[PDB]
Amino acid sequence: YPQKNAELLSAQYGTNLLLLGVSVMLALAAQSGPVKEEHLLSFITVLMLVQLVWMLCYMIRREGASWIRGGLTMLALLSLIMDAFRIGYFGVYPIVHALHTISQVHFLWFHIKDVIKKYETFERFGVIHAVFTNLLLWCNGVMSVCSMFSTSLYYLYPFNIEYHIFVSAMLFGPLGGLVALASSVSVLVVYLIVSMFYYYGVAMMACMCVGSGTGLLVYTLDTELLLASSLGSWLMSWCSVVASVAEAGQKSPSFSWTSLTYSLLLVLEKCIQNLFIVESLGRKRQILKNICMFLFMCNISLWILPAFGCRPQYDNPLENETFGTSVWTTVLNVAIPLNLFYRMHSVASLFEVF
Amino acid sequence: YPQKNAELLSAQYGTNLLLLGVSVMLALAAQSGPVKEEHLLSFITVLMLVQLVWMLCYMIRREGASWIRGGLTMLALLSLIMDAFRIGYFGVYPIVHALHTISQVHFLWFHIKDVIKKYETFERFGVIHAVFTNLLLWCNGVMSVCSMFSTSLYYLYPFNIEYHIFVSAMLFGPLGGLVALASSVSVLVVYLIVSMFYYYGVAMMACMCVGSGTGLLVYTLDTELLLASSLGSWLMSWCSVVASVAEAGQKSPSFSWTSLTYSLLLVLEKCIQNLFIVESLGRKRQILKNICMFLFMCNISLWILPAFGCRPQYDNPLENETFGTSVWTTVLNVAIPLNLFYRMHSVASLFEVF
Ligand SMILES: CC(C)CCC[C@@H](C)[C@H]1CC[C@H]2[C@@H]3CC=C4C[C@@H](OC(=O)CCC(=O)O)CC[C@]4(C)[C@H]3CC[C@]12C
Ligand SMILES: CC(C)CCC[C@@H](C)[C@H]1CC[C@H]2[C@@H]3CC=C4C[C@@H](OC(=O)CCC(=O)O)CC[C@]4(C)[C@H]3CC[C@]12C
Ligand SMILES: CC(C)CCC[C@@H](C)[C@H]1CC[C@H]2[C@@H]3CC=C4C[C@@H](OC(=O)CCC(=O)O)CC[C@]4(C)[C@H]3CC[C@]12C
Ligand SMILES: CC(C)CCC[C@@H](C)[C@H]1CC[C@H]2[C@@H]3CC=C4C[C@@H](OC(=O)CCC(=O)O)CC[C@]4(C)[C@H]3CC[C@]12C
Ligand SMILES: CC(C)CCC[C@@H](C)[C@H]1CC[C@H]2[C@@H]3CC[C@@H]4C[C@@H](O)CC[C@]4(C)[C@H]3CC[C@]12C
Ligand SMILES: CC(C)CCC[C@@H](C)[C@H]1CC[C@H]2[C@@H]3CC[C@@H]4C[C@@H](O)CC[C@]4(C)[C@H]3CC[C@]12C
Ligand SMILES: CC(C)CCC[C@@H](C)[C@H]1CC[C@H]2[C@@H]3CC[C@@H]4C[C@@H](O)CC[C@]4(C)[C@H]3CC[C@]12C
Ligand SMILES: CC(C)CCC[C@@H](C)[C@H]1CC[C@H]2[C@@H]3CC[C@@H]4C[C@@H](O)CC[C@]4(C)[C@H]3CC[C@]12C
């Protein structure tokens, strides 16, 4: 049997798998009579069950990496406690999801590395199924003692979405840094006990742009992953830029050239850092070392801030009136958990450079 | 200067170019105060002007293929008369668009082939700009004597969108066939002078599936283009399948197992034909020849039918109540002009096989 056809036929299966999801999601976004949320939960439940069964059949037949695995396991633990909370609240979906999570963690830990290397068409259909089950659970995620459950679900939400992003992915000077690490926590605490976030972010992004530009002046999977994760922040930034300029057209002190500069600096920071990292992969070596140090000790600060819930973007009245509550909320729900992945990738890459 | 960075930096530019569009489109879909349609028209007008200027600078510095060029030129002629009608109705956009169309046609005809071969960073930024200007004009297209203008704009609409698809692309037995060619016109005329369309399509897709399957039993850019264009019909089909099943849950004779079979056959037909074509690229040779003949003389029939305006899908009350008028309309607006590209590609490929 020619094996190229398996790549094509499986690929067609995979895209039909995604497109069926889109159809059921579209019929749900419309909030029409015939399609209810339970139909989407049933659908994906059926896809997880199919996956589990595939893994069981595989086990029957068989009669950098450290950072990736650590991130995967910790995200899995958070996505599993997310289900412990859902199950505690009361349906069926959180149980199949918990089983799926446990399965994925185990398979990725022990087999995806080299066991799968020797393969034919069974694995080619299995992997595509897993990729489009995860990449469709991220869709469902993004779309979707009462205060105890609400608080825990809030804090765990970006980690469940990031979990799905991370699994999708796999299946398919120094003094300023050290001060910044303490400042991140200080900003978080004072926020919990708005404008400080934007001022901190602008100052931090300007310093990062200067550092990375200096490093460039002194001078394929990683580049693609950096760009793929960068798109979340780029979308969020351009939404803020469009709303800020549109309001700036009329008489309004809303923007105060602080949300526009912030958004443009975020775009510039990412566009420069991606090149610095890609290029990195006698007296000048020390400054390059200081650049690598100051940069990842800064990356961590901007990764802790959204990770611990200080995110003020959901409370912005400008881009909610401009884009709509559900649209702006969804855009933030996409950009935030992907940004939490990008920053860790950046830290690990800069560390390995150093 | 290292040239790899140009690929990365230009790529970042290109995706930011797309994301800015998305932001302005999102602020427009919301139909909020600050963003009007004129801001989107101004935006893209600015991008075309930039492109034109790029081409002028390029000309200053310089001090299968037949089917592709023919399709491009005829689509350009239809997209240009589209502007002749818009200009006749009265702003600025149709004039810049006409200039853009004339530019593209000329550049693609004489230079894109080999003149650009010798290049550095100017061309790398130029091509990405052109790709994301066209691939964003397709977005605007899809979203958007009065009866004379309405009639002409209706008939020319799929050809303007297909024009943008085609340009995006480039920048980045026998007796049954002969009868089918006459039947396509007969069906078109009787439709203009509904159920016949669905019965014809079901009969035709079942015959195509049998032919292609038989050919497979007897036994990289083209495969990717076939899949990329197939996704339009796959989305449209899964929308019909989801709405049909959801209605089938309740007591309803709407589906009548004619829209569900049609949609599933369309998916199967495409999934089998894509493999037949990819595999194709003593006594059994004659049947294979008959298969190639019967198939492209059938492909043409299903390409003439939507091309000449017999498309009844816009009048479906089921998938408009199920998905919403604007959503179902948009889905058809995507699937139809892409399907018109797929079928021509299929005919040209089968012809070359024969
Ligand atoms: C890298 C490749 C394999 C995937 C590319 C990312 C996808 C996961 C993205 C691409 C476009 C996205 C889709 C864009 C638009 C919509 C429409 C949206 O429907 C709406 O609610 C709009 C208004 C309405 O219809 O109510 C629901 C999510 C969905 C299907 C999307 C979910 C995420 C998708 C599939
Ligand atoms: C990588 C490149 C080449 C692809 C670029 C595609 C992105 C620009 C897409 C992918 C995900 C999309 C988003 C995914 C889903 C939605 C859902 C939609 O929200 C709704 O569900 C409708 C509101 C309601 O619930 O009524 C608004 C559009 C938005 C934010 C989409 C906007 C466009 C995005 C960012
Ligand atoms: C092959 C690569 C380079 C591109 C992939 C195809 C894109 C051209 C597609 C992918 C997802 C699509 C987007 C999906 C979702 C939306 C949301 C949509 O906004 C809505 O109207 C939803 C509800 C609302 O917000 O009112 C407008 C079109 C847009 C931006 C899309 C336009 C076409 C996009 C960018
Ligand atoms: C190639 C693979 C890996 C990517 C799959 C992405 C598709 C599933 C995306 C690309 C284009 C998207 C469509 C582009 C734009 C819209 C606009 C949106 O319509 C609106 O503008 C909102 C209605 C209003 O105007 O109020 C509804 C979703 C829809 C049909 C999107 C549904 C999801 C689609 C088909
Ligand atoms: C990885 C895991 C083993 C340890 C850390 C992950 C955290 C996200 C988890 C671990 C246990 C969780 C806590 C237990 C229950 C709590 C209810 C209420 O009072 C506010 C949130 C509340 C205090 C939770 C916040 C998030 C926590 C702290
Ligand atoms: C690798 C990475 C994915 C791990 C992330 C772990 C964090 C999400 C965990 C670690 C410890 C947790 C905190 C401890 C208890 C806290 C008190 C109460 O107000 C609820 C939030 C509260 C402040 C928690 C927020 C989430 C934290 C910060
Ligand atoms: C390529 C081009 C040179 C020739 C064919 C392309 C067609 C899509 C174009 C050519 C001229 C166009 C016609 C001229 C004006 C007409 C107004 C009204 O009575 C109904 C539509 C109306 C009759 C148009 C239909 C579409 C036509 C027929
Ligand atoms: C290569 C490909 C992109 C070329 C497509 C050309 C067609 C769109 C053109 C060719 C001739 C045109 C027809 C001639 C006049 C017609 C009478 C009136 O009722 C308006 C529609 C009317 C029936 C036209 C529909 C569009 C046609 C069929």
From Swiss-Prot, chains A, B:
The entry summarizes the disruption phenotype as follows: Fishes display the backstroke phenotype. Mutant fish exhibit otolith agenesis without additional effects on the sensory epithelium or other inner ear structures. Otoliths are essential for the perception of gravity and acceleration. Larvae without otoliths are unable to orient dorsal side up and rest mostly on their side in contact with the ground.
Q: What main location does UniProt list?
A: membrane
Q: Which organism is it from?
A: Danio rerio (Zebrafish)
* Domain of life, per lineage: Eukaryota
Keyword ATP-binding among UniProt keywords: no
Per the UniProt entry, the effect of residue 238 to A is:
Abolishes homodimerization. Impairs surface expression
Q: How is its activity regulated?
A: Activated by both acid and alkali, with proton influx in response to extracellular acid and proton efflux during alkali stimulation. Inhibited by Zn(2+); this inhibition is thought to be pH-sensitive. Currents evoked in response to mild acid (pH 6.0) stimulus may also be mildly potentiated by exposure to Zn(2+). Activated by NH(4)Cl.
User: What does the function comment of this entry state?
Assistant: Proton-selective ion channel. Biphasically modulated by acid and alkali, mediating proton influx and efflux in response to extracellular acid and base stimulation, respectively. May be involved in acid and base perception. Sensor for ammonium chloride (NH(4)Cl) in taste receptor cells. NH(4)Cl acts by increasing the intracellular pH, thereby generating a driving force for proton entry through OTOP1 channel. Plays a role in the regulation of Ca(2+) flux in response to purigenic (ATP, ADP and UDP) stimuli, leading to increase in cytosolic Ca(2+) due to influx of extracellular calcium.
Question: What is the designated name of this protein?
Answer: Proton channel OTOP1
Q: Copy the domain comment.
A: Residues involved in the gating by extracellular Zn (2+) and pH are located in the extracellular loops between transmembrane domain 5-6 and transmembrane domain 11-12.
Annotated keywords: Biomineralization, Cell membrane, Cell projection, Hydrogen ion transport, Ion channel, Ion transport, Membrane, Transmembrane, Transmembrane helix, Transport
The record's InterPro entries line, in alphabetical order, gives: Otopetrin
Q: Which reaction does it catalyse?
A: H(+)(in) = H(+)(out)
**Complexes and interactors:** Homodimer.
Q: Tell me what the record says results from residue 269 to V.
A: In backstroke; causes otolith agenesis
Note the topology in the membrane.
Multi-pass membrane protein
